[PDB]
Structure formats: structure tokens, C-alpha cells
Ligand binder design. Structure first.
Ligand SMILES: NC(=O)c1ccc[n+]([C@@H]2O[C@H](COP(=O)([O-])OP(=O)(O)OC[C@H]3O[C@@H](n4cnc5c(N)ncnc54)[C@H](OP(=O)(O)O)[C@@H]3O)[C@@H](O)[C@H]2O)c1
Ligand SMILES: [Cl-]
Length: 149
């Protein structure tokens, strides 16, 4: 199913480019790991790497341009209305085409940005979240699963 992964600050002001406001009543916390706040804490990246391991990643063009090189050993799927500008990754012109390009896999990872997260959140089954404190440090990694009726 579809999963989102994101890093969220505690007192965030949510506009269009941000991870959406999600309804806590609709999400079950299934894993929570708290840790010491450390500057440039290396575990932040390791968390992303572990959780995206060997899964297709979908991202919007802005996010693609902020990263700039393909995440290795992952099909990298970039959403853009325009023809692609990097032959190392897969380019698609709609959400449906992005899902289609992933094939039959156990899990699809959406890695941002705000416009892309907003379109995929309503179809998502899991969230992988890094919670960030008032001076920009992670303090907790969390996995949530969507609550079904
Ligand atoms: N909290 C987190 O962990 C996290 C993670 C990653 C990124 N981010 C933030 O997200 C920011 C980017 O957010 P963003 O909203 O500006 O951009 P974004 O979602 O990365 O990219 C938006 C671009 O993707 C393409 N796109 C999106 N939906 C589409 C659709 N349905 N059909 C076709 N193309 C589509 C469009 O590209 P064209 O203009 O080419 O048509 C659009 O301009 C970054 O600056 C970063 O700071 C946060
Ligand atoms: Cl939600």
C-alpha cells in the first residue's frame, strides 16, 4: 500500500508546501522510539534509509530538485507536468501514472513535497514520521497505520 515519510516540527505553521494537517483520530500509533536531541543526528537519515529500503519512491519535481540524484536501488518516480530532465529517474505526469509505474510491490513510499503529500495522504495506509523539537532536533521516530471502520 501507499506510505508517506516525513519530518515534522512540533509547532508548525502548515501552508501548501508542508506536510498536511493529519487527523490524529484516524491514525494508530504502532511504533514510537524516543531519543536524545543531537545536532545533525545521524539516525535521521538512517531512519529514512531503512524505511525506504528497496521500495519505489515517489516525489514531486521540487523535492527532486532539492535532492538531485537518485536514491540508489529504488525506482525513483518524479511527478511533473513537463517532460523529464534527468534520464536516471522515471518521470510521470499524474498521480495515477505514478502508482502505475510502481508495479505490484508490497509498499510504495511518498517522500514529498507538500503538494505531493497532500494528493497521496487520502490514499495512504501508513505514515513514517520524524518528530522535531523547538530547536530543530529530532526526538522521536514513529510509525502510524490508518484506522479502519
Ligand atoms: N517534511 C518533510 O520531511 C519534507 C520532505 C520532502 C520535502 N519537503 C518540502 O517540500 C517542499 C516542496 O514542496 P512543494 O509542494 O513545493 O513541491 P513538491 O510537491 O516537491 O513538487 C511539486 C511539483 O510536482 C509536480 N506535481 C505535483 N502534483 C502533480 C500532478 N498531479 N501532476 C503532475 N505533476 C505534479 C509539479 O511539477 P511541474 O511544476 O513540473 O508540473 C509540481 O510543481 C520542499 O521545499 C521541502 O522543503 C518536506
Ligand atoms: Cl488524515
Amino acid at each position: 500500500a501507499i506510505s508517506l515519510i516525513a519530518a515534522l516540527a512540533v509547532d508548525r505553521v502548515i501552508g501548501d508546501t508542508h506536510f498536511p494537517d493529519y487527523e490524529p483520530d484516524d491514525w494508530e500509533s504502532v511504533f514510537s522510539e524516543f531519543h536524545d536531541a543531537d545536532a545533525q543526528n545521524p539516525a535521521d537519515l538512517a531512519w529514512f534509509k531503512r524505511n525506504t529500503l528497496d521500495k519505489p519512491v515517489i516525489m514531486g519535481r521540487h523535492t527532486w530538485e532539492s535532492i538531485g540524484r537518485p536514491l540508489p536501488g529504488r525506482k525513483n518516480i518524479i511527478l511533473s507536468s513537463q517532460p523529464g530532465t534527468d534520464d536516471r529517474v522515471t518521470w510521470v505526469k499524474s498521480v495515477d501514472e505514478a502508482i502505475a509505474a510502481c508495479g505490484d510491490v508490497p509498499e510504495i513510499m511518498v517522500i514529498g513535497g507538500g503538494r505531493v503529500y497532500e494528493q497521496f495522504l487520502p490514499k495512504a495506509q501508513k505514515l513514517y514520521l520524524t518528530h522535531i523539537d523547538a530547536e530543530g532536533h529530532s526526538y522521536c521516530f514513529e510509525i502510524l497505520e490508518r484506522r479502519l471502520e
